[PDB]
Amino acid sequence: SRRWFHPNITGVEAENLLLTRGVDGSFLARPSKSNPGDFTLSVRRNGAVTHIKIQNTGDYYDLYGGEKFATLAELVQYYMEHHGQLKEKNGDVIELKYPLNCADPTSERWFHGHLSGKEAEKLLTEKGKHGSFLVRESQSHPGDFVLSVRTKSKVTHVMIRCQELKYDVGGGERFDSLTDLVEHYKKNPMVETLGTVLQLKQPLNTTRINAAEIESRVRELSKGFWEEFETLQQQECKLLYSRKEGQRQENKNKNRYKNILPFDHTRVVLHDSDYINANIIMPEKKSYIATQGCLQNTVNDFWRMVFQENSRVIVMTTKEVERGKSKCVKYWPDEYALKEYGVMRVRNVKESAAHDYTLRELKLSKVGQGNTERTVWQYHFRTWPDHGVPSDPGGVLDFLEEVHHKQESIMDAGPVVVHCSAGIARTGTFIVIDILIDIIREKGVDCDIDVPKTIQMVRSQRSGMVQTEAQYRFIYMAVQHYIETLQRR
């Protein structure tokens, strides 16, 4: 987990922590209380503490005096090692040496706080498998905690004693935080005298729901969304995969933002150089490619990729110059016009304007070979607001239904190409919504969906997909809308 992240702390307290149990080079990150959605990097230097603003533009994380990033975890990783170059406007170096770990277990998946043993047993019974576990506060002995584990099946309760600030299960080693304890016993499982192993394989799932009762869950979260989202973020340390190819000198100018790079193990490798800032996304039979908006020097690469991957549908989530900002170089010809882009040729056959989007029917082929020609349908979503999300998800739902049918009607088509600015925020929101609806569309409303687990899966294929709580909520709203305007049928 992001040990260096402190969820319910204030600027003043954060100083006290670093001034008492931190040294020079000590750091932590916290949500900003002054700014909804923003964050702060409290660093200790020269016996004193600075607070560096980390803003979430809605598309990425912007570090004042630093770079832009897809996740906080990738941010800290970047300054904690290779290219440790964090400076003040004076030009002096701020070093991140020692993560100051948080004892507060609140946004841990396994932590349920105030909860009864009868309630906990219920959950573990019908939401659990071998290895499911959770940690609640003891109703019985206050200050202590109970670990409850599921393993012809049983549930087992182990007391966790809190003595003089440390935690122990009644013997052995005494830990500093409940997170320390849990990690230890995940790795070093408690055993019974009668020979049962108390395995801790995965926290008990509290986010999976049945699509039918989506309305009841949205009710609860709206009463929350914030907790669920934060718990999702606390998992991004499990996703720090290699992005070495994107860091090659030759590939640097091929990225819209230098530190927002494709994971090596899912990047699109261009044959016939080989680099593009794009990742294949496969749900765990429609697949996706998530990519940044084009750069003037990457347009030929965009079409190479489209041709190579056999994509027949493109989804463009950014509108034509939103206001005073380049979010994508125009990479398609004017209507009726025909253009070459390196070895690739594109004719714009026709444009249909809908209310929420524009459709361009494009003909793509390699130069020299007429036989390689295929129609690519570019779906250009136009009404996404400059700030936040659409008030109503209907326009988005309608847009995806059309994309889905187009894709479904074209035999043996490759991945649907989805892109926005950096290719992680709206790109992430559309893809997840589409994956969720796909599941419902195929399996009906008596099916299990887990929004956060779905985002996690996708985030293991491209960095930091889905950026904001608003996007998180909107995904929920979108799915609820689909369910409702479906049951009425």
Domain ranges of the chain: 1-107, 108-203, 204-489
Dist. CA 115–CA 219, nearest whole Å: 20
Dist. CA 68–CA 43, nearest whole Å: 18
The distance from CA 203 to its chain's CA centroid, rounded to whole angstroms, is: 19
Dist. CA 335–CA 350, nearest whole Å: 6
End-to-end CA distance of the chain: 44
Active-site annotation holds for 420: yes
Dist. CA 167–CA 180, nearest whole Å: 9
Nearest CA to 314 out of 417, 387, 237, 397 is that of 417
The secondary structure of residue 419, as a DSSP letter, is: E
Dist. CA 108–CA 129, nearest whole Å: 19
Nearest CA to 69 out of 463, 459, 468, 430 is that of 463
Map residue 470 onto helix, strand or coil.
helix
**Mode of pairing for the β-strands spanning 48-56 and 190-191:** unpaired
Please report the DSSP string for 246-312 in residue order.
GGSGGGGGG-SSTT----TTTB---------SEEEE------EEEEEPP-TTTHHHHHHHHHHHT--
> In whole angstroms, how far apart are CA 345 and each of 199, 213, 279?
58, 49, 24
Q: Give 164's contacts (C-beta < 8 A, 6+ positions apart).
A: none
Dist. CA 141–CA 310, nearest whole Å: 62
Dist. CA 430–CA 408, nearest whole Å: 17
Dist. CA 463–CA 61, nearest whole Å: 12
**CB-CB contact of 53 with 34 (8 Å):** no
Helices (H) and strands (E) in the chain, counts: 11, 24
Nearest CA to 34 out of 4, 18, 19, 54 is that of 54
HSE-CB of 202 using CA atoms within 13 angstroms: 9
Are the folds of 1-107 and 108-203 the same?
yes
Residue 80 zone, left/alpha/beta (φ > 0; ψ -120 to 50; rest): alpha
After which residue numbers is the chain interrupted with C–N beyond 2.5 angstroms? Answer: 151, 223, 272, 284
**Mode of pairing for the β-strands spanning 278-281 and 288-292:** antiparallel
The secondary structure of residue 211, as a DSSP letter, is: G
Tokens 């004719």 locate to: 347
> In whole angstroms, how far apart are CA 173 and each of 133, 149, 169, 193?
20, 20, 9, 19
The distance from CA 85 to its chain's CA centroid, rounded to whole angstroms, is: 26
Backbone angles phi, psi at 143, to 5 degrees: 95, -35
**CB-CB contact of 199 with 131 (8 Å):** yes
Please report the DSSP string for 21-49 in residue order.
H--TTEEEEEE-SSSTT-EEEEEEETTEE
Instruction: Please count the other Cβ atoms lying within 10 Å of the Cβ belonging to residue 172.
Output: 11
Catalytic residue among 102, 294, 328, 420: 420
Nearest CA to 329 out of 321, 317, 338, 337 is that of 321
Q: Which residues pair with 53 in a beta bridge?
A: 40
Tokens of 323: 């206001």
Nearest CA to 415 out of 295, 284, 317, 283 is that of 283
Architecture of the domain spanning 1-107: 2-Layer Sandwich (3.30)
Architecture of the domain spanning 108-203: 2-Layer Sandwich (3.30)
Residue 421, burial from CB neighbour count under 10 angstroms (0-12, 13-18, 19+): buried
- Residues 251, 255, 266, 282, Cα dihedral to 10°: -160
Instruction: Please count the other Cβ atoms lying within 10 Å of the Cβ belonging to residue 488.
Output: 6
Q: Give 260's contacts (C-beta < 8 A, 6+ positions apart).
A: 60, 68, 69, 70, 277, 292, 422, 423, 424, 463
Q: Which residues pair with 315 in a beta bridge?
A: 379, 418
Nearest CA to 203 out of 453, 431, 454, 30 is that of 453
- Domain 204-489 has what CATH class? alpha beta
Map residue 372 onto helix, strand or coil.
helix
Backbone angles phi, psi at 138, to 5 degrees: -75, 120
Tokens of 415: 């991945």
Tokens 């030009």 locate to: 91
**CB-CB contact of 307 with 366 (8 Å):** yes
| CA Rg value for the chain | 25
Dist. CA 334–CA 315, nearest whole Å: 18
Q: At what angle do helices 469-487 and 225-233 cross, to 10 degrees?
A: 120
**CB-CB contact of 182 with 222 (8 Å):** no
Tokens 């800290």 locate to: 76
Residue 50 zone, left/alpha/beta (φ > 0; ψ -120 to 50; rest): beta
Tokens 């956060």 locate to: 452
Residue 423, burial from CB neighbour count under 10 angstroms (0-12, 13-18, 19+): buried
Residue 447, burial from CB neighbour count under 10 angstroms (0-12, 13-18, 19+): middle
Dist. CA 111–CA 207, nearest whole Å: 13
The distance from CA 262 to its chain's CA centroid, rounded to whole angstroms, is: 14
Instruction: Give the containing element (helix H, strand E) for 17.
Output: helix 11-21
Dist. CA 253–CA 242, nearest whole Å: 19
Nearest CA to 92 out of 48, 39, 38, 29 is that of 48
Please report the DSSP string for 99-164 in residue order.
E------TT-TTEEES--HHHHHHHHHHH--TTEEEEEE-SSSTT-EEEEEE----EEEEEEEEET
The secondary structure of residue 240, as a DSSP letter, is: -
Dist. CA 76–CA 33, nearest whole Å: 20
**CB-CB contact of 121 with 127 (8 Å):** no
